[PDB]
Amino acid sequence: QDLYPSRQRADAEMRPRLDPVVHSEWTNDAPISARQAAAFDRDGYIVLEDIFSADEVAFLQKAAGNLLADPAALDADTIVTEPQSNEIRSIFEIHAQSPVMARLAADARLADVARFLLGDEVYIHQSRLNYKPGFKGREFYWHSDFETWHVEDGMPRMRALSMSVLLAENTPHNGPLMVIPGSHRTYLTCGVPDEESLAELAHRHGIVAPTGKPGTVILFDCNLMHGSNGNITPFPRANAFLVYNAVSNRLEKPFGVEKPRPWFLARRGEPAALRVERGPLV
Amino acid sequence: QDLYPSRQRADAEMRPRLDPVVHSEWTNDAPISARQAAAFDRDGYIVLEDIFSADEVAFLQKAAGNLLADPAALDADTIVTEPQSNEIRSIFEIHAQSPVMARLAADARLADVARFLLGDEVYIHQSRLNYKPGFKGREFYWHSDFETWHVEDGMPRMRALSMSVLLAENTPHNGPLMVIPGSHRTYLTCGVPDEESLAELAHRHGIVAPTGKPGTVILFDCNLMHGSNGNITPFPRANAFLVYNAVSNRLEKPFGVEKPRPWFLARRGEPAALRVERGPLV
Ligand SMILES: CC1=N[C@H](C(=O)O)[C@@H](O)CN1
Ligand SMILES: CC1=N[C@H](C(=O)O)[C@@H](O)CN1
Ligand SMILES: O=C(O)CCC(=O)C(=O)O
Ligand SMILES: O=C(O)CCC(=O)C(=O)O
Numbered sequence: 001q002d003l004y005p006s007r008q009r010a011d012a013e014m015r016p017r018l019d020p021v022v023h024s025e026w027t028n029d030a031p032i033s034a035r036q037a038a039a040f041d042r043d044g045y046i047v048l049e050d051i052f053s054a055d056e057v058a059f060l061q062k063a064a065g066n067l068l069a070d071p072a073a074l075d076a077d078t079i080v081t082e083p084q085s086n087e088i089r090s091i092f093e094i095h096a097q098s099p100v101m102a103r104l105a106a107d108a109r110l111a112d113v114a115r116f117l118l119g120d121e122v123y124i125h126q127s128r129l130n131y132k133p134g135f136k137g138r139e140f141y142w143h144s145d146f147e148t149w150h151v152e153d154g155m156p157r158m159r160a161l162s163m164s165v166l167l168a169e170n171t172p173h174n175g176p177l178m179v180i181p182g183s184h185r186t187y188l189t190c191g192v193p194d195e196e197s198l199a200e201l202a203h204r205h206g207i208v209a210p211t212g213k214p215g216t217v218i219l220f221d222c223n224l225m226h227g228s229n230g231n232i233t234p235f236p237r238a239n240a241f242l243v244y245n246a247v248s249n250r251l252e253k254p255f256g257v258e259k260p261r262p263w264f265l266a267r268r269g270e271p272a273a274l275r276v277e278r279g280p281l282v
Numbered sequence: 283q284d285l286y287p288s289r290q291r292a293d294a295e296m297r298p299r300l301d302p303v304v305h306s307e308w309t310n311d312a313p314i315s316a317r318q319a320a321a322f323d324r325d326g327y328i329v330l331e332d333i334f335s336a337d338e339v340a341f342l343q344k345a346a347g348n349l350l351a352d353p354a355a356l357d358a359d360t361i362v363t364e365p366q367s368n369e370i371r372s373i374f375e376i377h378a379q380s381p382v383m384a385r386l387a388a389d390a391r392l393a394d395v396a397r398f399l400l401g402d403e404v405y406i407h408q409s410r411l412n413y414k415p416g417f418k419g420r421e422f423y424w425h426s427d428f429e430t431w432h433v434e435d436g437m438p439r440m441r442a443l444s445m446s447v448l449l450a451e452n453t454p455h456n457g458p459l460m461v462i463p464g465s466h467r468t469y470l471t472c473g474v475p476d477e478e479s480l481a482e483l484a485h486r487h488g489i490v491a492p493t494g495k496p497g498t499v500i501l502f503d504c505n506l507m508h509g510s511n512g513n514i515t516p517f518p519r520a521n522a523f524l525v526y527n528a529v530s531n532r533l534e535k536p537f538g539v540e541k542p543r544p545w546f547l548a549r550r551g552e553p554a555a556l557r558v559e560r561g562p563l564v
């Protein structure tokens with residue numbers, strides 16, 4: 001029942017992936033092009049530009065701006081500072097609190113791609129606004145999102161993806177998301193990946209740090225190795241994260257101990273199919 | 283006496299540069315092109331690529347890893363290590379402690395450009411060899427070299443430049459040095475520059491981060507605002523740092539209190555000129 005055991009041996013292994021990456025047959029009636037599906041297959045991520053209008057983008061940026069400026073109105077449980085601070089690092093369940101964000105996640109232009117790639121109905125496993133403050137923004141060391149979702153939340157299979165919607169401009173200077181392309185086809189066991197292994201992957205695959213204007217979307221497979229550096233620039237980097245999970249891939253018990261995990265980190269346990277909203281955002 | 287007062291008020295000022303940036307008239311005798319010289323004037327830095335042969339590059343790389351591997355053989359005060367291990371991170375006065383580095387700093391391809399740009403005979407105010415490992419590389423916040431060299435060392439005029447000779451590859455990803463071009467014409471008073479000022483400079487000049495294969499040289503005016511982000515990548519940062527000061531501009535007493543500063547951070551007091559060296563490094 002555990003296809004992806006981790007944190008059990010005193011060594012790390014590079015286990016082979018035992019799941020599809022794209023879980024659908026591609027055809028003309030798909031939300032992305034055949035080349036785009038093959039890219040995701042091969043690289044474990046793709047980038048979508050100009051899929052929202054500037055009115056849509058502008059509306060979005062204020063939704064995030066407003067949530068991040070009145071943090072006494074939202075669940076105190078769902079706020080992450082840089083602990084020794086009170087500058088915000090993330091805000092969880094933003095699909096659950098902000099209506100604007102809820103409407104975003106349910107939009108066809110995101111969810112249909114999510115359903116095509118996962119070949120199933122989808123639901124939000126998790127959401128976050130990773131506001132990366134200028135001057136004092138701290139990094140996110142390398143990790144496979146799936147390796148925590150699996151051991152800690154009990155996500156059984158590789159059938160999920162993240163969508164990062166950029167709300168500030170991501171230049172190469174304010175700590176954008178870096179990925180190791182192709183790393184999604186290796187399951188690297190551990191709770192933090194080991195330097196020697198990481199070194200092997202990045203050598204084998206190099207590193208990409210996709211940039212883009214606000215409204216650009218980065219979609220990466222749940223098992224892609226990724227991270228980011230800190231941000232000392234005056235430019236904040238606020239990026240909404242949406243984790244789509246296939247409903248077939250509902251959470252069983254955590255394939256580890258410390259079971260279970262806080263409610264906003266991971267949605268348990270019986271999901272309803274997302275209702276896909278076709279339209280703009282006003 | 284003091285043209286550049288700093289650390290003497292609770293309010294920082296942005297004061298104007300009262301020195302030239304390029305101290306010489308350009309002709310066809312200059313070791314750089316007229317557009318390069320104009321670019322240094324305007325931007326505060328330029329980048330020389332391919333001035334060293336690959337053999338010469340491999341030679342410097344071999345000598346620097348040698349020096350970094352052998353702390354026994356070097357002055358103990360001029361060493362910096364990691365507060366958890368005995369890994370070297372810096373060696374000061376390498377222009378002194380290493381004959382190779384002493385020959386790099388006297389090479390015409392480097393010293394003649396300083397002599398032109400500074401319009402005087404030069405000498406090493408400070409040299410360094412830096413190894414910044416991957417994975418755990420630390421940030422290094424914004425600051426003008428000249429501000430500390432003025433207040434703490436007694437450098438009286440803006441008549442110095444820094445040369446960073448890349449010994450490992452700097453991609454956009456491994457925390458490469460960042461500069462705010464044009465900020466060398468503004469003297470930001472204070473010993474850390476404040477955020478609002480830094481934001482102002484970055485908003486009006488933007489941020490650039492010169493990358494390059496090893497052997498690439500980055501030259502920058504002493505008062506150019508710079509800094510770097512952290513480095514989680516598996517790719518180390520390594521460089522030879524060389525500060526050329528014009529002999530005309532030798533250190534007086536500090537324009538602050540805490541007089542003075544350790545020998546290996548700033549060469550007092552009546553230095554001789556450097557002797558340029560033409561020819562290969564092997
Ligand atoms: C809940 C969550 N866990 C992973 C982690 O803890 O690194 C991350 O990849 C993202 N979100
Ligand atoms: C000793 C030295 N100090 C500056 C600094 O640490 O802020 C750097 O800009 C250059 N060299
Ligand atoms: O935005 C970041 O740099 C963190 C990305 C990440 O690993 C996540 O929380 O999904
Ligand atoms: O100190 C650092 O590492 C930032 C780069 C720099 O200013 C230097 O070391 O010369």
Ligand SMILES: [Fe+3]
Pocket residue numbers: 145
């Ligand atoms: Fe993540």
Ligand SMILES: [Fe+3]
Pocket residue numbers: 426427508
């Ligand atoms: Fe510096």
